[PDB]
């Protein structure tokens, strides 16, 4: 066995995948077999989700996370997000599950049967980690693949059925996007938006014309930079900036993935556009806004004048002003006055929540939505007891938004730790002291004392 | 060549014998209904 | 070489588990404490002492099982199996919480056996007995919490019950009734525990990151040999790193390792003293000058007055079930509540 | 050498008494800004309407507080997650009423403490050390992000972040238990095992090394003088310490490798505190501790209480009393 | 204590004929109540309107009386306000609004009886806990 | 007097930090 | 190194497993039967799911007298029939 023990490889069993750093044939097989694990799970989970799925229950009541991802794409859903057909979920699960036997085969093949190194067999599929031009070429190859993937979403939205649109007028529906936002002041304007409250950076994207036109821009940028990296070598400022080794490139992707996981955690928590509340449940802000709506509606039905009702503190019990003066829901939900959702936006005038609209124009579908969202707030226990920590056992609910945000916080945190681990190790390995201090030339011993 | 019953044998069985008894008891408890 | 010296020979044989003279006390007392806990949490109820289910046999999980304390009407009774409460009936003894005092007393004498074992082995191998001295802190904590605390209170009922959620209740009881977070002896304990965990993390990372390259492997554990005279890591490099990062750094390895003894041991001893005060309800409950000001100025609010409102909530909401010997009927209108909730 | 080369040589200089470095050019002004504003606001800030309900909480020493009760109070619930610098306020008086200092302190501190982590990598790189001290510091740094930033983001308001004060810390803890049952969350339990274990292993490693110190001194002197700074021989007998501890428990429960020992000393508290940080950070999105309220039911259907139901009774009392004027509707949803 | 026939015997109508439910019927009713009703009615309260609970004495003072099986079954078909004055199917789940409350679509009369039996048996089991809220947890 | 006391002790601690860092007994390799 | 036989040598030998493929399942089945026959309730006095309360009892049978506590439990148990 070449490199499959600690004496020959330098790495113990518990760091045994580091024995593959300079074995590109087996290292390719590790990646292809692991790609098959991802695709296996995407297929197996979907079939599990579909086999447990009740179409007359909402998706968010059923512990589903992958069916809502398919439904948001426009597949299998009708107006308001009701499931009109379970066959697209069955196709997406089956095709992933079959394809993972394919990726599993070539992963197993390259990792046990194929050549341990690809360099002798092929100059095109071989690489040195230190060959900067080969590194940018493969980077360019994968950038093109990702840009085409972003245009696949555009093609779904424009030419192959559309996407589910929670903001579609007259209630949410699958809608073909015809005029995506191509204006770069809007698309790149989200990049300069503050991440703080009321702004929210890219998480604030609130319409599918911005989502589709952004993916047009991303798909063309990734194809352009793909072609750019195939046809260039890193400039001297980048050569003197970075560490050029496999562990270093891993660490850059680790920091990149950690940053993206934190972003997705905030996406699923706050955004009800690309994570529609009919599929994922109400957001945290949404349900708190929906409780204030529920008790405004009930008490105003009893005869209360909700605009003039003073709470215990002297703020309005139902309605109050935000610090810039917009009319907002009172109580603790004053913090969530930046929430925007299709059940609430009909009540909102130019200066905020309109008292005349609130008195007259609250439809029964809004009252049903407010009560349903208030009672499906993303709060629950680890054993999936719905509601506050003091609630009794009965309701079996943890919102998908809570599952998706918490999982991706954990993953993004540990990926930041992995970034720090591998980036520090790659620097020490390139500078040559990752195995410790040379006793015969210890650096501090030739530095002057601090005092 | 080695002995079979030592102090170590007793120390092991004072833990392991009741442990396997308790695990069988706790397994049976998973099938009780109210 | 009489019978005593022959017995002393056998007790101190180099075997897999050392026995020693201390093992006569340690081994049966520790095994009965552990075995009593596993027995009670698997099979024994708390229905007659607390009105609680507390075993796996009743339906509880690992987080909710406990060997619960005896009923408050037991007082500080030793609850011996042959004592006047059980009168020899094992089944009644279990139902009266006799397992709690069984575990607490065998556990106490077992801990005494463990420190004697630390002293005995240290004397036989020829090392200094600092491990026995550091173990006085867990002994001070067990004695103050499980013995001195209920002895100052009405009965053994108010000691911690041996169980995970039962211990969590004990934490919440000490907040709501004793305001134990406000106590400077607890605060000194927190600093000792979190300081010791800091010292554990910082010393282990520093050694592992100032290691000398003593081998060619990238996995560096093999480059230590247990018989080497030389240091495996650079004290000089470690000292320069921390002097520049943090301003101060250890320069004496012996003082460093003493300070690692001192910090969590002193912290736990400090926390034990505060619990001894809470045995008599000698709490650091209030700040009088803030209470005088808050009572006359209804706009004066601090986080301290906010915490006391939480404490009052804890007491009125938990006391009827947590203290079912008091027969508390608090009608719903007497319950302190905020608006809406 | 031009001025930029002379400047870069100074910044990354290993001969400075405290290492500056590139992370330090961010760490130094942000931490100074956070410290100065903290000391001023702790001494002299006016009361702060933390809950957005025109009910200002006095945090400073000059306004009644002592060291224990004092706090820099988290910013107003009316602000939420909105960025509130000084220049957003119409006056300094308004900024102080709404809890402006808190946002300034925590943002500067978290930026500076992140750069403290990078500075720990940076110096170890300059000194030729191995780089993973900063990974160990990521455990308390993540905890600080958890209570000051991640928990406010999930709950929608910096009013819910941990206050910068001793009693405010306890207020944060009690309310968190009321709403999340953190004691019943296994990530906090792993966190407790981290710090209890860390304190145990600190005392254990300290005592075992002190127990096995080689005799170099007389009775009339401190034993610490038996060690000289920079000496090459080890100052204790690790074989004697392993011989003790391997007989206290059993031989294979004791480390005979000091590198494996010291890695275990790093790994146990750090992983546990990492899990404690992920406890807070995932309870930020309301995935709470285990709920066994009314889990045990008799044959008729009577609830048989457990210790978990007793915890719930305490949690209810904290719940109904916290922020006693702030709730208008029957569910505390954030 | 056991879930005897006397516990499982609830009023069927307003006159006074009783029905003794089976343990299978009560346990199916609890499952369907959790499935369709406990998101607002957990423990016998009403989360979106705490003034009106599911206590037996409260359902008795409803117009028409809902403190029997057929009264609860008619409410699950055609729910009203507490005085019976308005029909609230457009905001309350029922058989007649199963198109907007889709968990009500495949409910049988046997299912509606079982849910109605669970609402009547449960306060005989739990006492003041049912409809009491957090005070009695 | 209370506020003066607490600030005084705090200022003495910060002064102690200054002397402990900049006027420490210098660690000497021997 | 203290003279006893190594654990790796024992648990990998056939004679260990000839002995233990009987003793280990026998102890497990004995523990199972301790619960399934109901003996664990009788030995420990733990209430069965139908013997916490009398049929219309809402009150917990709390022991209130130290020296008559054995008699109170017995009285509480006679109240269940
Ligand atoms: C390396 C480069 C970086 C280093 C330099 C540091 C630069 C500073 C980084 C900024 C950090 C920002 C903190 C505040 C984040 C925030 O309040 O985050 C929340 C925002 C989302 O904002 C919310 O976005 C919402 C958008 O929704 C709106 O639009 C939606 C449309 O569907 C809905 O309609 C919704 O109802 C409507 O309100 C609203 O605007 C809310 O008001 C607003 O709060 O998330 C975001 O922008 C997503 C990004 C946040 C990432 C979270 C970072 C976590 C990092 C953890 C680090 C751990 C460190 C460990 C150290 C060891
Ligand atoms: C995603 C998980 C993953 C993947 C894809 C790999 C992949 C690899 N590891 Mg790594 N490793 C992992 C996790 C993983 N590892 C973990 C968790 C550990 C710690 C236990 C290690 C510790 C480790 C060490 C110590 C070593 C490796 C080595 C290797 C390489 C060769 C393995 C070998 O010699 O097989 C030999 C084993 C077999 C042939 C037995 C069966 C294995 C096959 C592949 C099972 C396939 C089953 C699957 C169901 C078949 C489906 C077929 C179908 C699709 C048609 C290979 C690329 C070796 C290496 O680096 O070589 C230089 C090496 O020395 N790994
Ligand atoms: C993005 C990842 C992700 C998310 C958000 C979810 C979310 C969900 N899953 Mg899914 N699932 C996943 C991955 C995920 N899963 C994986 C990897 C598997 C294969 C095992 C599954 C297989 C699966 C099944 C079979 C089922 C679910 C179900 C569910 C639902 C209920 C979950 C529950 O009760 O957990 C229980 C909670 C735990 C098990 C505790 C998790 C704590 C983790 C392990 C901590 C990890 C930290 C760290 C990474 C590990 C330490 C490393 C560190 C030292 C560095 C929820 C929607 C259920 C459902 O409702 O289906 C409809 C269900 O039946 N999942
Ligand atoms: C990252 C993935 C990847 C990469 C870089 C390689 C690279 C290689 N493979 Mg491997 N292999 C893979 C995955 C991969 N393979 C998979 C998934 C399987 C299972 C089918 C195999 C099974 C396999 C065998 C049996 C053999 C190789 C061989 C080779 C070598 C020559 C192949 C060639 O030039 O054909 C020329 C390429 C073409 C004519 C076009 C490729 C055709 C595919 C279908 C296009 C797919 C592209 C599309 C985007 C992917 C769709 C799924 C996507 C969404 C993920 C080269 C090193 C040979 C070898 O080992 O040499 C010693 C060899 O004998 N591969
Ligand atoms: C996965 C995607 C990917 C990766 C790994 C790379 C990697 C690389 N690119 Mg390439 N590039 C890409 C996609 C990618 N590129 C795409 C899609 C395009 C088309 C837009 C390009 C166009 C491009 C050009 C024109 C150049 C590169 C260059 C490089 C090399 C050095 C870059 C560098 O120093 O960054 C680090 C960035 C800096 C040092 C600049 C300062 C950045 C600030 C401080 C960060 C601000 C971000 C912050 C987090 C805020 C984010 C939100 C914000 C919008 C508000 C490196 C090999 C350079 C090169 O070597 O060419 C051959 C180069 O000149 N790339
Ligand atoms: C894409 C992500 C990625 C990749 C490709 C690598 C790759 C590598 N890592 Mg890195 N690492 C990563 C992310 C990654 N890492 C992250 C996120 C962290 C933070 C936790 C680390 C922290 C880390 C450390 C501390 C070390 C490495 C090391 C390595 C090298 C050897 C790995 C090995 O053989 O482990 C074999 C696999 C195992 C021993 C099993 C790991 C099990 C984990 C800890 C628990 C998983 C629990 C699971 C999620 C849930 C429970 C399920 C269970 C009950 C079945 C290899 C180059 C080693 C190295 O530096 O070599 C140069 C090394 O010492 N990594
Ligand atoms: C070193 C071992 C050790 C120690 C220190 C203890 C200690 C204790 N046990 Mg435990 N126990 C042990 C081993 C031990 N036990 C073993 C191996 C078993 C299994 C058989 C038990 C089973 C057990 C049960 C069931 C109970 C205890 C109890 C106790 C407590 C009270 C004992 C008592 O008062 O007797 C007093 C006896 C002596 C002090 C011996 C005196 C010796 C003197 C010096 C000589 C004179 C004796 C004299 C000649 C006798 C003549 C009688 C004549 C006058 C009539 C005490 C903490 C009780 C308890 O836990 O309370 C809740 C209890 O109920 N033990
Ligand atoms: C090997 C060094 C690794 C560093 C060790 C440090 C971390 C150790 C982790 C904890 C122990 C983990 C298990 C070791 C894993 C390991 O390394 O195994 C190795 C070890 C010995 O293996 P063998 O017996 O095959 O080897 C004997 C040698 O002579 C080989 O010839 O196995 C055990 O000791 C089995 C444990 C059974 C335990 C029986 C205990 C009986 C009760 C004793 C309790 C009384 C003492 C209490 C006193 C109050
Ligand atoms: C290298 C390596 C490794 C790894 C491995 C891997 C990772 C692999 C992968 C693998 C894979 C990744 C595989 C896959 C496979 C799959 C398959 C085999 C599939 C199947 C399918 C089917 C057949 C289906 C069916 C169906 C249908 C069609 C319908 C519905 C129903 C059902 C589902 C039944 C380890 C770690 C061990 C270590 C050593 C080395
Ligand atoms: C799709 C979409 C969209 C769009 C988006 C876009 C347009 C994006 C872009 C983005 C981008 C365009 C990104 C960027 C990024 C960047 C980064 C992230 C950077 C970083 C850097 C770094 C990391 C560096 C580092 C360093 C330093 C700092 C110093 C020196 C050295 C070094 C180099 C190391 C929207 C929202 C509309 C909507 C929805 C959908
Ligand atoms: C009290 C008493 C006594 C004693 C008894 C004893 C001593 C017992 C023992 C018992 C025992 C001695 C038992 C055992 C048990 C065991 C168990 C129950 C186990 C379980 C296990 C498991 C469940 C596992 C788990 C885990 C862990 C822990 C960690 C890692 C992971 C796992 C998952 C594997 C006498 C008669 C003298 C007298 C009277 C009273
Ligand atoms: O702020 Mn501070 O503590 Ca968080 O839950 Mn909602 O809001 Mn208020 O109540 Mn509970
Ligand atoms: Cl509060
Ligand atoms: Cl509210
Ligand atoms: Fe050490």
Author numbering:
A (entry chain C): 23 to 473
B (entry chain F): 12 to 45
C (entry chain D): 12 to 352
D (entry chain A): 11 to 344
E (entry chain V): 1 to 137
F (entry chain T): 1 to 30
G (entry chain E): 4 to 84
Task: Give the exact sentences the study uses for this entry.
Photosystem II (PSII) is a multi-subunit pigment-protein complex embedded in the thylakoid membranes of higher plants, green algae, and cyanobacteria, and is the only molecular machine capable of oxidizing water by use of visible light in the nature. Water molecules are split into electrons, hydrogen atoms and oxygen molecules at the catalytic center of PSII, namely, the oxygen-evolving complex (OEC), through four electron and proton removing steps as described by the Si-state cycle (with i = 0–4, where i indicates the number of oxidative equivalents accumulated). The overall structure of PSII obtained by cryo-EM analysis is very similar to the SR or XFEL structure in the crystalline state; however, the PsbY subunit was visible in the cryo-EM structure but absent or partially visible in the SR and XFEL structures.
An overall atomic model of the low-dose PSII was built based on the highest 2.08 Å resolution density reconstructed from the ARM-60k dataset at the dose of 3.3 e−Å−2. The overall architecture of the low-dose PSII is very similar to that of the high-dose PSII, with a RMSD of 0.21 Å for 5310 Cα atoms between the structures of high-dose and low-dose. Nevertheless, when the atomic model was refined under the same conditions for the high-dose and low-dose maps, the occupancy of the OEC for the low-dose map apparently increased. The Mn–Mn distances in the OEC refined under these restraints were 2.9 Å, 3.2 Å, 5.1 Å, 2.9 Å, 5.4 Å, and 3.0 Å for Mn1–Mn2, Mn1–Mn3, Mn1–Mn4, Mn2–Mn3, Mn2–Mn4, and Mn3–Mn4, respectively.
